[PDB]
A paper describes a structure:
Here, we present the crystal structure of the de-adenylylation domain of [name] and reveal the catalytic mechanism of [name] de-adenylylation.
In order to confirm the role of these residues in metal ion coordination, we created [name] mutant proteins in which each of the four aspartate residues was replaced with either alanine or with a similarly charged glutamate. In fact, we determined the crystallographic structure of [name](D110A) at 1.9 Å resolution and confirmed the absence of coordinated Mg2+ ions within the catalytic pocket of the mutant protein without noticing any significant effect on its overall fold. Furthermore, mutation of D110A in [name], which directly coordinates both M1 and M2 in the crystallographic structure, resulted in a dramatic reduction in the amount of Mg2+ to nearly negligible values. In contrast, [name](D92A) and [name](D110A) were not capable of reducing the percentage of rounded cells that simultaneously produced SidM, consistent with their lack of de-[name] activity in vitro.
Numbering used by the authors: 37 to 84, 88 to 269, 277 to 351
The structure:
Amino acid sequence: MRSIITQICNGVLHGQSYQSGSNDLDKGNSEIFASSLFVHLNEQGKEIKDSDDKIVIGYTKDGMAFQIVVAGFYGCERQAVFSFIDNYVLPLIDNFSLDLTRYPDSKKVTESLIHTIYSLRSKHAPLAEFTMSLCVTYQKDEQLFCAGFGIGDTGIAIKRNEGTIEQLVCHTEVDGFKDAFDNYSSANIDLVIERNSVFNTKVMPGDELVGYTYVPPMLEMTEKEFEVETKRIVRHLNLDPGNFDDKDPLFSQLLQVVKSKQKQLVEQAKETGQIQRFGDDFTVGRLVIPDQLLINQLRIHALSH
Ligand SMILES: [Cl-]
Ligand SMILES: [Cl-]
Ligand SMILES: [Cl-]
Ligand SMILES: [Cl-]
Ligand SMILES: [Cl-]
Ligand SMILES: [Cl-]
Ligand SMILES: [Cl-]
Ligand SMILES: [Cl-]
Ligand SMILES: [Cl-]
Ligand SMILES: [Cl-]
Ligand SMILES: [Cl-]
Ligand SMILES: [Cl-]
Ligand SMILES: [Cl-]
Ligand SMILES: [Cl-]
Ligand SMILES: [Cl-]
């Protein structure tokens, strides 16, 4: 492949966490963390399945940064999902960045990419059923932008250099549905796209993108609820920025806030001394937007292989 992958996590073994460390190639700008927040207690309140999440972070051959955040539906399909991302999604990213540069309407470019992903999934990976968000940088008018999307329940937030956190891709919930890259959702792709997230924004070097699968739901807030005709309620869920401040990286603070909450949940759960079951796979990725010097260094690195 031509893209530079600086961090990748293909699931994590039951009972284990994964901490990627930094990659010197991108000066510590990218990292992954992956832990299960699944809590499963017997009647006596004692503790009793591999992760299906995948994150990929890297840079195109042109130095443009991307993050892909994926959560598979079913354990027995995890390899099909993981393979589909490597074989079919990753190779699209360079041309997505180039098209975003070259065409006027980022929304049309992104929509077209989503249709293409659904097409390839149906032609080449029927067992790859998953939710996914992604984003890539691109250069236009001597500025740097970031565009992408999310279908399903994964999220991407950004903490800007001055400290404000905003949501780029929300966790979308649709009454009675599970919108995803799957056979079911592929019957009405444009409706799925309109009720999930597409984004395009200006970014500056040092702005920090944080992608995530599942967070404990009391850490989110409802940014919007709306009715969709096909008579269904859609909710867009954001990371509640009240749990964060301006000083530390958002990746750092998310892991802290989740850990502290999960500690409370596990303690509550044990002390009820009853059956409890809740939580899911938690995987988080960090991508700091590169400056022009690193972008150049990456382009050169990609040439030599
Ligand atoms: Cl471990
Ligand atoms: Cl399963
Ligand atoms: Cl595949
Ligand atoms: Cl590639
Ligand atoms: Cl293209
Ligand atoms: Cl646009
Ligand atoms: Cl857009
Ligand atoms: Cl399709
Ligand atoms: Cl398959
Ligand atoms: Cl430019
Ligand atoms: Cl949003
Ligand atoms: Cl849903
Ligand atoms: Cl449709
Ligand atoms: Cl706030
Ligand atoms: Cl710069």
